[PDB]
Amino acid sequence: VQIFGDQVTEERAENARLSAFVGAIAVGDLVKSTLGPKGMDKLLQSASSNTCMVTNDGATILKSIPLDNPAAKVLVNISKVQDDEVGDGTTSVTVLSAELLREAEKLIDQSKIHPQTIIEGYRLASAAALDALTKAAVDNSHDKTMFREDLIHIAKTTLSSKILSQDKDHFAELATNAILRLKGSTNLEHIQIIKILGGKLSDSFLDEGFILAKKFGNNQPKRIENAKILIANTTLDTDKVKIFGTKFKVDSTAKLAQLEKAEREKMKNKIAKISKFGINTFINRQLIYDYPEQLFTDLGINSIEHADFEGVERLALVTGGEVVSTFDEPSKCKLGECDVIEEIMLGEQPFLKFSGCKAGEACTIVLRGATDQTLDEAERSLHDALSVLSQTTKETRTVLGGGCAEMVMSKAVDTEAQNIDGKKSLAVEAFARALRQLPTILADNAGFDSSELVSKLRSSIYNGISTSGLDLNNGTIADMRQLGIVESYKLKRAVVSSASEAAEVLLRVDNIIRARPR
Amino acid sequence: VQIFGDQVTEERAENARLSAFVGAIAVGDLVKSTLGPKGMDKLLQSASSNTCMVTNDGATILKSIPLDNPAAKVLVNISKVQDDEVGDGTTSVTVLSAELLREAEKLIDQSKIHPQTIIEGYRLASAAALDALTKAAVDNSHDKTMFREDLIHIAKTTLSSKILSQDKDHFAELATNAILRLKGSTNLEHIQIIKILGGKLSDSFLDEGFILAKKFGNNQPKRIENAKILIANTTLDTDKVKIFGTKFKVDSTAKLAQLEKAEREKMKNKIAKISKFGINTFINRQLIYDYPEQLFTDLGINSIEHADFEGVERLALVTGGEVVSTFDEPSKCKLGECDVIEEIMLGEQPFLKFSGCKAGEACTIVLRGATDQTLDEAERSLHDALSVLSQTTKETRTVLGGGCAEMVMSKAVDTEAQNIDGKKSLAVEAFARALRQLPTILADNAGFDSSELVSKLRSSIYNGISTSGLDLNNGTIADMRQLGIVESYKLKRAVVSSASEAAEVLLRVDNIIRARPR
Amino acid sequence: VPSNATFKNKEKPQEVRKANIIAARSVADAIRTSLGPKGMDKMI
Amino acid sequence: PSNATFKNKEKPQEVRKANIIAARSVADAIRTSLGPKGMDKMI
Amino acid sequence: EMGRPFIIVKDQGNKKRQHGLEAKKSHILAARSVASIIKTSLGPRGLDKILISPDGEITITNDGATILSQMELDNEIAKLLVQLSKSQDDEIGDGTTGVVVLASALLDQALELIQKGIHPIKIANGFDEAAKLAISKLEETCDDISASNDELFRDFLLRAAKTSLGSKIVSKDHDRFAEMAVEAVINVMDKDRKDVDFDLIKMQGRVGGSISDSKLINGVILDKDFSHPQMPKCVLPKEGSDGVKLAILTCPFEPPKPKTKHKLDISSVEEYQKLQTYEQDKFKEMIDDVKKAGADVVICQWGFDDEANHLLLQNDLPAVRWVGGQELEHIAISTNGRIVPRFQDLSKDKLGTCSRIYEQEFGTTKDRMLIIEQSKETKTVTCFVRGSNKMIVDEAERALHDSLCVVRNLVKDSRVVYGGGAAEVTMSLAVSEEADKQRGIDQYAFRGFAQALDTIPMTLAENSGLDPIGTLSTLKSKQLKEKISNIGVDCLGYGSNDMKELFVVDPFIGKKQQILLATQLCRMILKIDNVIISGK
Asked: Where are the transmembrane segments (chain C)?
């Protein structure tokens, strides 16, 4: 008796547990070679428009590639959350969560361990892993000099896994200063990224000001000094008033010419109130017609049209001014100040460059690349670096990276495995061997040994030295404090917590039910 | 550029490998549940004719199941070679050869070892395993009492996995006495197996003398006392004249009437030469016509016709005589004597029974079962038991079984692994853990924890006691000398040699080129 | 008490044995009506 | 010798070989269009 | 046939008919296929299951109500078990996996009785009489905990909370989940400890962070941010205050216009110039009514035009736009405010009061969400759940939702039981004892109902890797030697089979429905004879 309908795929037996674990192996092996500074980028073939996308980030790779396996969708969702929360480590979460299923597969098959026992084994194992990172965290926020220096070392680690590892020394200061300009702001929508094609990759710079791609409408000069910037969001172009039930009752067209002329009088009266501020520049996010633009010619006021609303907030923070509507009251309204405003040209498209702005709360990053694939990679590489440095201003705790943080956690896991006894010792020790995979894959992508090199790092920590780490350049054990490899503490907890929770998902699935597609 | 053609499937490098490993896991998991006395039988349903077969033999399972994987046929052929040379342990060969690849799969992955380096590890490990297994063997046949008792212990071990395991206590004497009566000659053509419906499995009894299903002549009596048995190669049939190649030229029918009468007198004179022997029984290889049959009634000679090619040699050795052809010289071809030629009936088909013959060189086994599915396995269960007992006559070296032999061989592997420098030492230790997978499955199929039984057995042997083994009845460690588990050295040597060579072939495959099927 | 000893794996044989018993009892139900002097003949 | 790392993957180096062949095939098509002696291409 | 087509009903060959023993065998096996699915997920050692929707979305849960809801079936007998667990989740909300196992256990024991020649109605008549004997027996064993004060009453709520939190994913945090689920009812409840309103507690999920960030926040959580975000994110009250004076408005900010379609005819320039002044006078009047009332944060249902962005910025008045109508009801309950339909009716007494209004950054980008806190005990408690996976944030909702369904059932007076299989064993021996006194034709009916109750304790031993025979024999021998009914199956292996020391507590109203829903459903299934199923 079949209760299910036609074309319903279900596995109630070993085929289900095998497909769930193997399904995560193909996902883990895909992003395995992308871990570390020696990793290689992946290519994405689009099914439409033939648009190729090359990205090292594991979040985009898993979401772009279609996956019908529910065991694979679990590792895709945790990568989207890791990208949206911390902003980095989407590959480390997918790899670490996949290795937890690798050690859990041999316990159920060979060791004959209960599935919940493996789950309950990670519960007491993750408690020792998170407590090990707390004692190893150092707070440098007590000194502004030591805190600013740590922001540079964190950027060098994130930019190493991407294509920027060669120029990351020059780009570490650009990402460090950009976060210092925010003054603790964790919002990345205030920083504009303008991608320019051509030139050297090392020519990327960060100006102090707001670089706008839009240009002045007609007669406004390109360069002007001592110009007050004003921002107006609403209307000012052929005002419709408000209600749509207004009409003009005209007995003869002689009066109709006076009704339309009164509309232009409302335009002249509104622009006349703007000149009372004494501003040399006016900016509207809505496009400005030809009639209201000509009124600024005799007043010597600049005009800018078609500004995006997400750029208005970016523009208001650079000028330090205030968005002003209802111009009737000059007192309560505030205007922005700028030393000099010049229209430059980068490539074929001319740009609007600002300099000498009062407020530094926002900036604009300009990038250079040989291909658009490198431009799309340079923007995502900085988006992952600026996200970690933004959360560092909130939580200032940092943990050394480069294989050091993974092995320190495994030291406390092996200690708690003795007091548990039972059959959970095989599950707790499986979590310690799963932490060995992250520093091991770092050596695999560089062509090093996966056994003796890892054993040198493990034996050095048990001798009383917690500062030992893995050096991929020389292929030996080096000190992480001297090399300057460190990551944020929030990134360390996010990878361990997300992988431990994602591993508890697929281990609880005995049966997989697939409804007929629609 | 595609040189091969259309519809040509090929895998290279990482695509080629892991196809043989998973292919071996799929084959290994089918016979994994059939290993041990507590193992479960597998039912095979054919795609045509709706024929089902219940068999516990790992060789017969792989031959029936179609497999398109080129690496799967590697484990199928070694199961046939093990079945051809010995006939027992074909399941252990498929499992052990699969466990060598499962351990080598993590060697190339975790430890990053070249596949050819792993091959050099098995060469040094198998050399030390055969030396430890040879020294553990005990000499046999020096005493006729100990030689017969050892054959009883072998039959109980082989039938333990078979469906005969319940009645194998009484069947140990059935299979033992058949080998002792062979008088040193090793052949299974001399052993007959007859299937009978009805009764119970333990109703199978040993046949004193030789029993073969035949029928007496029409006028011939059933019971003859002290009858002489003769086997004739030549058949009584129309011979034309002599050389064939001829036809009679008849000018007048007066000579044609006496011509056919002359042919009747030729076969009559041939029986007259047979009657000079004074035999009460005659056996022919092919159908006998009714004309020569009537000459046997007046002479008191029994007639047996339609004798199979194998039944000619089976009957000739039991009586002691030889096949007679020319009949000319009475002194040659001295004939034996049978005490009781009286026919009995088992079921609805009467079976001709003999008793009190001169030689027991040929045997017959009567088997009774409820269904043919049991009778099909009952024949193959004794066929595997009689094969090892027959090889024990020529090969007297025997070792202790029941999971003890695999653990003793693994002890010498870990001893020499410490003196082997380099990365190939990891492949040597992997061969030792692969030998521990066979006793591990023995505990899994019996419902007992494998981690507890193997750990207690592994540590007990390193203490110097090599007589420890696995007891599945009490679920603890017991002595193999007291339980009476003995296996031939040729059996265990063929398992280690065939599995080590089969795994070596699949590790040498970096590419698989599949031509278009016909 | 749990989490120790062993855990049952590959439970498909537990379902295969149930599928074989249910299929065998279904055949025994048709012949059951023919048992005893009150049984009926089966035309095939 | 036997202590070397096999890396388990020969695919990464084979994928780059297929990418270079297709990339050079595109650059070789416009090769005849280079210089004052170049030839026009109609698309 | 006589040579003419004989069709009684349209789609003759499409529909099929089942009758006799074959119709009953197909109904029992349809329930056995659903039972073996639910029996694996029953108990704290159970396992979840993946639910693939036709749209591609996946769902991982052990809940029998959620699994069967998204399950696409064919046979109608298996579809009757779908609404069986749905009946358990809608009203009680606890024990959805137990009603399916118990119902199929009644059908398994009924199939053996049908083969013996028992009429199906006689089987259903025996289960109805045996159902009231089991409920009346368990009702006398339990005791009333209402004599304890409010200090001990909170302990019983923590006992039954940790029981329902098990068997589901993210069961390691159940210690904090049990504390947060009880404090929601402590804040929102009647003074007489009766008829608590469940609708005042809302479940709001959030995807991100970790499970350790889940905490109780009393207030309103909205997905809309402050309009014109030039204002500070965290709003603070004045030095001295009665409160924040939160304002709620269902009317957008616009010059007054008739609801009907209107035509405003301007026949002269003077009439057009008056509209210019009349336009700005209304936006100046609407912003002054809020300032004179002392209100700070203004909530608009339809939003407002960009004209008021800088107007509300001068007066430092936070504002939100495009707030849903259902959320407006949730806002007025937390702050105890009153919705103001128009500025003419705006007064200081209709303004809400909350402790603090602020927004959280959450992750990197995501979206902006507003959070409201209360300074004292209020009638609104909003659940805040975080997780590293979309599946965890989803299942945790219904995990705590079912946990709140257990606590609200304990609000009912004088109903408590102890779980762990101790309830089914106690009610099983009471039915088997009556079978010896009654005898007759119904003697085999009480035996089938007694063996069906023991299936739940035996199912718990399967997921824990125990022996169902040795475990059930110990429980039956304990109830005969001593009258203590608190001995039951322990799937956690902590020892002390007494439920009193293990604190496991279940509602009686939840266990009483399991017998009623299983017995009354099998009574209808056994009456089915002709099965007509049309082709799709």
From this structure: none
